[PDB]
Amino acid sequence: MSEVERALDVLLQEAEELCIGSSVVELDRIPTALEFCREFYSKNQPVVIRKALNWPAIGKWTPKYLIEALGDRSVDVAITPNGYADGLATQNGQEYFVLPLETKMKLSEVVRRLDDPTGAVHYIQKQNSNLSVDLPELAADLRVSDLDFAQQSFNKPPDAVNFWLGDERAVTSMHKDPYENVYCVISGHKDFVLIPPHQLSCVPRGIYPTGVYKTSDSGQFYIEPLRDEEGSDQFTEWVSVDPLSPDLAKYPEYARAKPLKVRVHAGDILYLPNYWFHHVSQSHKCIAVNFWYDLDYDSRYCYYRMLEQMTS
Amino acid sequence: SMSEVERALDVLLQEAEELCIGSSVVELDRIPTALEFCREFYSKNQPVVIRKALNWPAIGKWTPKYLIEALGDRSVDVAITPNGYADGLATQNGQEYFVLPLETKMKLSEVVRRLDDPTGAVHYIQKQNSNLSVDLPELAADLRVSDLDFAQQSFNKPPDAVNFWLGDERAVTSMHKDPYENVYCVISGHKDFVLIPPHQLSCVPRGIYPTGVYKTSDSGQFYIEPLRDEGSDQFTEWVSVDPLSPDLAKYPEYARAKPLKVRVHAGDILYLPNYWFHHVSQSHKCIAVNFWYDLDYDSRYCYYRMLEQMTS
Ligand SMILES: O=C(O)CNC(=O)C(=O)O
Ligand SMILES: O=C(O)CNC(=O)C(=O)O
Ligand SMILES: [Mn+2]
Ligand SMILES: [Mn+2]
């Protein structure tokens, strides 16, 4: 082994022996603020809390209710042919990281498209705090103070509050965010696959030309490459593995990853700590809200940047 | 120019330098809540000094005379060196050794007598190993350890050691690190710490030195005796640099270190987080007590083990 390979081996053997990030802790009761800070926030350690929330949104938010309550408002929706907004797709021999087609439409039309299992895949996943900016009325059916047990660790209000409503075919491919994430399913369920950041060396990442989905004259989807004004492809680094069906022959390093699986039901809270890898699937027409808080930087981020350099 | 390992260490250090990780000892004027301590200091591996935090009876009462009277002029373990560097590097006959102190037992009144001799050998009650709870139990009555609950609730375990320190100004503790969270309480005088964060390991030169112990001859003159396993000469890894006057020509990598200086007065508390390098000096006949808690292994330990592998 190289000296870098020897060092990465040491990291992984130590983390394995000490069970770092080796499970998703399951709680049936909301912990105290101190508990959360000590056992989950400070260890960068995920946790799922079952039936933690009894917000009126839970049990009342349906497509019909939302159409009524919002007056069939026009909302931002992402559309893909293949179900992978912000995900890899191939065209004419080339693999692209592809951004969704984004458009505006009335909620009733979104619901109609969600009821077509062979049509294009629709997903209200704009995030960018779309709930507080675009759907503020929904806030009245939530109680954010119920998240104080976690927010005390972040010691600031959410930097974003997001609303998600999607087709079962809409899959969020694996990525990491520079946020603490408190994830609250409202209706249906979400299936998460999670990988700890210290396993970066087991997760293959490529550099892909970036494209965006567009529709042709005939309504057919294609990928429009993004180029800069110099004619160069705009590149995006992206996780290359499919956690649902990994090709261990192409990516043997992934064999050493220990992906964690967790289903999150209505009323459950998942704490997804900063820089954790996650891939997300959903039940059909699943509804969820989530709260992003900017991370607080310490040495772990610098070690992560070192890990990136070592695997480059 | 640079190896792969050296490029990776450079990225680590550049990211830590831009974020100023561990760039200052935090100054508080009052004891934080447990949640605050866990969020701002424990979880960040971040040193903090709390000014005039403690009013323990000891701070008023512990003089040499009171200590003699209270311990019945007990015979105590005391460490003696000629140069003031117990557990520190010294040269003899052209060879550089890491030297352990001459350890002996003598009555406290005699120790104090020898502290008052500015030209005599350097004495230091530095046994650690929880010498206060073990060898000087009565002194506990002048303490209020409950006042440290703000920190202990974050370590969520009782102290693993309680140590008592009383030293000559000449007695200096050379730079080292400990696998313990350290809550350090100055009772009389002041301590001067030089602190270096663990992610700067590659900036701190470390060597392998033959191990020796101080002894005195029939004539009273000090010398170093090599230590041998009951076998070969024994060796120890030790920090090579003198942070008070570093030889940057011999150790240019130390120029990239960013040491912190903090003075801890009577009544003050210093949180010295696990694995931080520290060098410690004291006012004359300084008295201190500290508490060690075994560390909880997290990802930072795994990263640090990897860093040790890369720095060898
Ligand atoms: O809900 C999804 O499909 C994906 N969500 C996220 O990546 C997130 O909350 O960070
Ligand atoms: O006080 C001293 O001289 C040295 N103390 C320590 O190294 C410590 O408390 O861990
Ligand atoms: Mn995400
Ligand atoms: Mn120490």
Swiss-Prot record, chain A:
Positions bound to Fe cation: 175, 177, 278
Catalysed conversion reaction: L-lysyl-[protein] + 2-oxoglutarate + O2 = (3S)-3-hydroxy-L-lysyl-[protein] + succinate + CO2
Entry binding sites for 2-oxoglutarate: 123, 172, 181, 183, 190, 292
Gene3D superfamilies with a match to the protein in the record: Jelly Rolls
SUPFAM superfamilies reported in the protein's UniProt record: Clavaminate synthase-like
Domain named JmjC: residues: 124-310
GO molecular function: 2-oxoglutarate-dependent dioxygenase activity; endopeptidase activity; ferrous iron binding; identical protein binding; peptidyl-lysine 3-dioxygenase activity
UniProt record, GO biological process: circadian behavior
Tissue specificity remark: Expressed in the pars intercerebralis and fan-shaped body, regions known to be involved in sleep.
Single GO cellular component term: cytoplasm
Modified residues (Cysteine sulfenic acid (-SOH)): 19
Disruption phenotype: Viable. Adults possess disrupted circadian rhythms displaying reduced daytime sleep. Adults show decreased tolerance buildup following repeated ethanol exposure.
One Pfam short name: Cupin_8
Cofactor(s) required for function per UniProt: Fe(2+)
Taxonomic superkingdom: Eukaryota
Family annotation (PROSITE patterns): JMJC
Residues binding succinate, per UniProt: 123, 183, 190
Localization terms from the record: Nucleus; Cytoplasm
EC number: 1.14.11.63, 3.4.-.-
Entry keywords, A to Z: Cytoplasm, Disulfide bond, Hydrolase, Iron, Metal-binding, Nucleus, Oxidation, Oxidoreductase
Assembly description: Homodimer; disulfide-linked.
Functional summary from the UniProt entry: Bifunctional enzyme that acts both as an endopeptidase and 2-oxoglutarate-dependent monooxygenase. Endopeptidase that cleaves histones N-terminal tails at the carboxyl side of methylated arginine or lysine residues, to generate 'tailless nucleosomes', which may trigger transcription elongation. Hydroxylates the guanylate binding protein 128up. May be involved in regulation of behavior and circadian rhythms.
Protein name per Swiss-Prot or TrEMBL: Bifunctional peptidase and (3S)-lysyl hydroxylase JMJD7
Organism annotation: Drosophila melanogaster (Fruit fly)
Lineage, opening ranks: Eukaryota, Metazoa, Ecdysozoa, Arthropoda, Hexapoda
